[PDB]
Curated annotation (Swiss-Prot):
May form homohexamers. Interacts with N protein. It catalyses: Thiol-dependent hydrolysis of ester, thioester, amide, peptide and isopeptide bonds formed by the C-terminal Gly of ubiquitin (a 76-residue protein attached to proteins as an intracellular targeting signal). Inhibited in vitro by GRL-0617. Residues 1-167 form the Macro domain. It is found in: Host endoplasmic reticulum membrane. The chain holds residues 1025 to 1191 of 7096 of the full protein. This is Papain-like protease nsp3. Responsible for the cleavages located at the N-terminus of the replicase polyprotein. Participates together with nsp4 in the assembly of virally-induced cytoplasmic double-membrane vesicles necessary for viral replication. Antagonizes innate immune induction of type I interferon by blocking the phosphorylation, dimerization and subsequent nuclear translocation of host IRF3. Also prevents host NF-kappa-B signaling. In addition, PL-PRO possesses a deubiquitinating/deISGylating activity and processes both 'Lys-48'- and 'Lys-63'-linked polyubiquitin chains from cellular substrates. The lineage of its organism: Viruses, Riboviria, Orthornavirae, Pisuviricota, Pisoniviricetes. It is a multi-pass membrane protein.
Amino acid sequence: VNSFSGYLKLTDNVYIKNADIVEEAKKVKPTVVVNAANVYLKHGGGVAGALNKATNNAMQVESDDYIATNGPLKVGGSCVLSGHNLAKHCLHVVGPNVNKGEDIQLLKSAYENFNQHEVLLAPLLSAGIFGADPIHSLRVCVDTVRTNVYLAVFDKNLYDKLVSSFL
Ligand SMILES: CC(C)(O)[C@@H]1[C@H]2CCCC[C@H]2CN1c1ncnc2[nH]ccc12
């Protein structure tokens, strides 16, 4: 039993809700919140900018030190950093950006990072400003993640389309 509330069950391990991941995180304080990051951990907009803003820029300050020490992430890769006031940990995951010419097959590699965590609150990777089809992202998520994932879909119209089209 966990404290996630109001989710629709899609599969044995995947759940979905029309909600802002930032608001879900503030309320639940999950062990892991996933950020839809880029390789530079530059949290400008979308999920990343919204999470970072909610931490009063502490996520960005921590991230800049991470990059100065370790260099950029790989597309498809991840790192675990603090969740600040929103969660115990933030798993920063980089899905491919099709606007940058990055390979969509890397979306599966990105979701594989979720399997290192028993329970996660997450957005659909590569959706929104990353330019990929959110329906496809949900399919890859369901077919790749085996741990328990709670997906927050910020756009209500998109949520309804995802549920109604889900096979
Ligand atoms: C596709 C996805 C991941 O569901 C959505 C999608 C909704 C409309 C705009 C573009 C995307 C933003 N993203 C978010 N998801 C959850 N929480 C969020 N907080 C702020 C942004 C945000």
